[PDB]
Amino acid sequence: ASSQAWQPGVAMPNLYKMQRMLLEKCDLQNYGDSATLPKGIMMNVAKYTQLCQYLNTLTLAVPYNMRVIHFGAGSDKGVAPGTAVLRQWLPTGTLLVDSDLNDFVSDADSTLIGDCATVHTANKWDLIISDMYDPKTKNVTKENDSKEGFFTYICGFIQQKLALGGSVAIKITEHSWNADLYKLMGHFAWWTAFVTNVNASSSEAFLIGCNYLGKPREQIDGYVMHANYIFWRNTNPIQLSSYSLFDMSKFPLKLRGTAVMSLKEGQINDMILSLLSKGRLIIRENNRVVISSDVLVNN
Amino acid sequence: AFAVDAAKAYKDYLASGGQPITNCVKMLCTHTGTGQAITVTPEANMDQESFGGASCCLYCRCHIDHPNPKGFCDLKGKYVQIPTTCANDPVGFTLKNTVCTVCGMWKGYGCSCDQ
Ligand SMILES: [C]O[C]1[C]([O])[C]([C]OP([O])(=O)OP([O])(=O)OP([O])(=O)O[C][C]2O[C](N3=[C]N([C])C4=C3N=C([N])[N]C4=O)[C]([O])[C]2[O])O[C]1N1[C]=NC2=C1N=[C]N=C2[N]
Ligand SMILES: C[n+]1cn([C@@H]2O[C@H](COP(=O)(O)OP(=O)(O)OP(=O)(O)O)[C@@H](O)[C@H]2O)c2nc(N)[nH]c(=O)c21
Ligand SMILES: Nc1ncnc2c1ncn2[C@@H]1O[C@H](CSCC[C@H](N)C(=O)O)[C@@H](O)[C@H]1O
Ligand SMILES: [Cl-]
Ligand SMILES: [Zn+2]
Ligand SMILES: [Zn+2]
């Protein structure tokens, strides 16, 4: 039991990010093993709780009337466990919208049903969480290439609807991944690939972009960086652990009361980027929130 | 008007030895809260388990209309505390029991506005 068994999960070390590996198969030492969960707790409740526990340690910008959108919030069970946790984690008064391809009941303020490509919104968001995964990814019939689908929408949504100073957490796997998404992590003050301790036996990780700067700070090759991630996962077996779930005393996200300003592409200087990079500032309109779901009309 | 009374059709389905509605979302908490029935955040005590409201609401879980002016749901977006002993069927518990408007506890499980 390493000192990381007591953490909510493990973040990809900086030295692994600087390598230039070739993509290899992901062969985890404990693949298929299950973690021991607190009695009656669902896997996705444990998983979302560890992710939020980890997000609490980052320089997230947390303003009043914060805006969080959650893609891939449904499940075959018909409920939204991850949305239940985000609701628990976020400060009261936080607007939480969730969405999924299939119907499901949620504790979110608004729920949009349908492909993410049909979701539109006038407003920018402060935090984006995606747990979307296409079950067809399980058909490995060729090379492990950069997948498109909802990943294309996500790269567009981040560049167009994420407030500067805003953060993201996007679920990826060995085969469920996209190169443009890795390239985008370079447009944040900081980024990492985070593995939850309860699901440490899966190639799954959340790419976390912290404090969006709107422009590239780092040049990242997605094809190289995903190989660097698989290399790290292949060479660093992580011990399954649910210990962080037993202390829920510090869980709720602190309402840092981050400042929200409506500047144009002109007032963006170094004094500003500095404040964005420390989650001290959110830059976006503060208009009322409007979302729509396109409806294709056939016979 | 043929008003579909599912609230009772469930009571009649349980009493006939029927399996309770599953996949209610139980939350992780300290178990050191007020113990109140409905709360903006998990408030379970050492004797209660907290759940997400939407997952415990029969109307929400059956995709039907909420008997309420403007169809407002008072579980969706909140957390319901269920006595650890009756946690096997949280949906059933939220129908058969009533909340005290004075202290906010469940009448019959915490509400002591009589003794
Ligand atoms: C809620 O979130 C879900 C999960 O929690 C999360 C992670 O799930 P995962 O299964 O762990 O993923 P993975 O196997 O680690 O990666 P992969 O990209 O699916 O690999 C594809 C393929 O490659 C092989 N492989 C991959 N790896 C890493 C291997 C290995 N073989 C080994 N011997 N050793 C290994 O280390 C194996 O054959 C795999 O099938 O993904 C979501 N999700 C999964 N399935 C669905 C779904 N959501 C919706 N519908 C779904 N049907
Ligand atoms: C966690 N994090 C990492 N960094 C940057 O990456 C550096 C090293 O990343 P690190 O997470 O390994 O920090 P370290 O373990 O050195 O810090 P300690 O816990 O205080 O000892 C940080 O000092 C920052 O420059 C971060 N930068 C920003 N803006 N926000 C973050 O949340 C953040
Ligand atoms: N293009 C797409 N648009 C929207 N949702 C999608 C999608 N492709 C996959 N998904 C959804 O992604 C989800 C992955 S599993 C999500 C589990 C959920 N986060 C929880 O808390 O339990 C599935 O529900 C699937 O329907
Ligand atoms: Cl770590
Ligand atoms: Zn309801
Ligand atoms: Zn009372």
Numbering used by the authors:
A (entry chain A): 0 to 298
B (entry chain B): 18 to 132
Excerpt from the paper describing this PDB structure:
Finally, a metal-dependent Nsp10/16 heterodimer methylates the ribose 2′-O of the first nucleotide (usually adenosine, in coronaviruses) of the nascent mRNA Cap-0-RNA to form Cap-1-RNA (m7GpppAm2′-O-RNA) using AdoMet as the donor. The active site of Nsp16 MTase is conserved in the Coronaviridae family; they all utilize a Lys-Asp-Lys-Glu catalytic tetrad essential for the enzymatic activity.
Structure of Nsp10/16/Cap-1/AdoHcys was obtained when crystals of Nsp10/16/Cap-0/AdoMet were incubated with solution containing Mn2+ ions. The metal-dependent 2′-O methyl transfer catalysis was observed in the crystals. Two structures were solved at 2.25 Å (Nsp10/16/AdoMet and Nsp10/16/Cap-1/AdoHcys), and one at 2.18 Å (Nsp10/16/Cap-0/AdoMet). The electron density clearly showed the methyl group present on the adenosine moiety at the 2′-O-ribose position of the Cap-1 and no methyl present on AdoHcys. Comparison of the SSX structures of Nsp10/16 with Cap-0/AdoMet and Cap-1/AdoHcys does not reveal any significant changes in protein backbone (Cα rmsd: 0.52 Å). On the other hand, the comparison of Nsp10/16/AdoMet and Nsp10/16/Cap-1/AdoHcys complexes determined using SSX indicate larger conformational changes in the Nsp16 that are induced by the Cap-0 binding and Cap-1 formation. We observed movement of the two loops (comprising residues 28 to 35 and 131 to 146 of Nsp16), which form the capped mRNA-binding groove; positions of some residues are shifted as much as 3.00 Å, with an overall Cα rmsd of 0.40 Å. After the methyl-transfer reaction is completed, the product is released from the active site. All these residues are involved in interactions with Cap-0 and observed changes perhaps allow Cap-1 to leave.
